[PDB]
Design a protein around this ligand. Structure first.
Ligand SMILES: *SCCNC(=O)c1c(C)oc2ccccc12
Ligand SMILES: [Cl-]
Length: 284
């Protein structure tokens, strides 16, 4: 049959959006924990964004991978919509970056590789995330990544692939092409990847300033710098991702795809087929 709010005990808030919350929920019957995404219909109705919410729901129902959140169930209330998602016990990657300052090389390689492997799967389904960043990369009980927040995700097509883009994600991770021509492709997610790797090694994202206009100006100029203490092979990797021309980013279709990305020297040691079974290095 169907589930109702009364079937659950609602605990701590795991996430806070403007129009939404994610709450830790225990299903009383089974005692299984879920992260439940709760949407107020009022806001969705009022902004005429129903098609967008269904899009999120559908995109998520296509995900069956260890590195991605899973949609288990959906039910409905008088004033609220509920999505039951996998619960990532250890919270946001950002929390760990903040706690230890920056990742050592072992940890950088390991988590970058999970992210790259996650992206190859996602993109292989014609799906782009569009808001990739450390706060949307969670860690599960086993400290593997769980990529989440599919509210901005889009299914791509070859006609789509190339100037209508509706959504501009978080300023620090946005690619130049989203800003200037309102294009959004797989490559734009690869730009975000480069920002994230840089952030893991350096402790903070590459493009930084006192407001979003100033951050955008740095992005479109490619105005950023590596600190002296930056793993050389990660720097080469980052330099091959943070490239203004979207068709020249390591990993995009035009650069012969994921093969060359996974074959970058920073990933020499990585065994790509068994990642989700490896015990992750301790974060220190
Ligand atoms: S829980 C069944 C999945 N339902 C929806 O996604 C849904 C329906 C039928 O009506 C909606 C209105 C607003 C948001 C989501 C909605
Ligand atoms: Cl392998």
């Amino acid at each position: 049959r169907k589930k109702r709010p009364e079937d659950f005990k609602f605990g701590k808030i795991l996430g806070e959006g403007s129009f939404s919350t994610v709450v830790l929920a225990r299903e009383l019957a089974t005692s299984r924990e879920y992260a439940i995404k709760i949407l107020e219909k009022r806001h969705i109705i009022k902004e005429n964004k129903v098609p967008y919410v269904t899009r999120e729901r559908d995109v998520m129902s296509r995900l069956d991978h260890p590195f991605f959140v899973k949609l288990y169930f959906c039910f409905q209330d008088d004033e609220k919509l509920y999505f039951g998602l996998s619960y990532a016990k250890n919270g946001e990657l950002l929390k760990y970056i903040r706690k230890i300052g920056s990742f050592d090389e072992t940890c950088t390689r390991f988590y970058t590789a999970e992210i790259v492997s996650a992206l190859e799967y996602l993109h292989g389904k014609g799906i782009i995330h569009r808001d990739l960043k450390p706060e949307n990369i969670l860690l599960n009980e086993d400290m593997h990544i769980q990529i989440t927040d599919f509210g901005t995700a889009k299914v791509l097509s070859p006609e789509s692939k190339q100037r209508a883009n509706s959504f501009v994600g978080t300023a620090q991770y946005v690619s130049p092409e989203l800003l200037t021509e309102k294009s959004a492709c797989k490559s734009s997610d690869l730009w975000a990847l480069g920002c994230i790797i840089y952030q893991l090694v350096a402790g903070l994202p590459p493009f930084r300033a006192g407001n979003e206009y100033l951050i955008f100006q740095k992005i479109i100029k490619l105005e950023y710098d590596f600190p002296e203490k930056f793993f050389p092979k990660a720097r080469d990797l980052v330099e091959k991702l943070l490239v203004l021309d979207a068709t020249k980013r390591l990993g995009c279709e035009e650069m012969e795809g994921y093969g060359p990305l996974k074959a970058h020297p920073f990933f020499e040691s990585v065994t790509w087929e068994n990642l989700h079974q490896q015990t992750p290095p301790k974060l220190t």
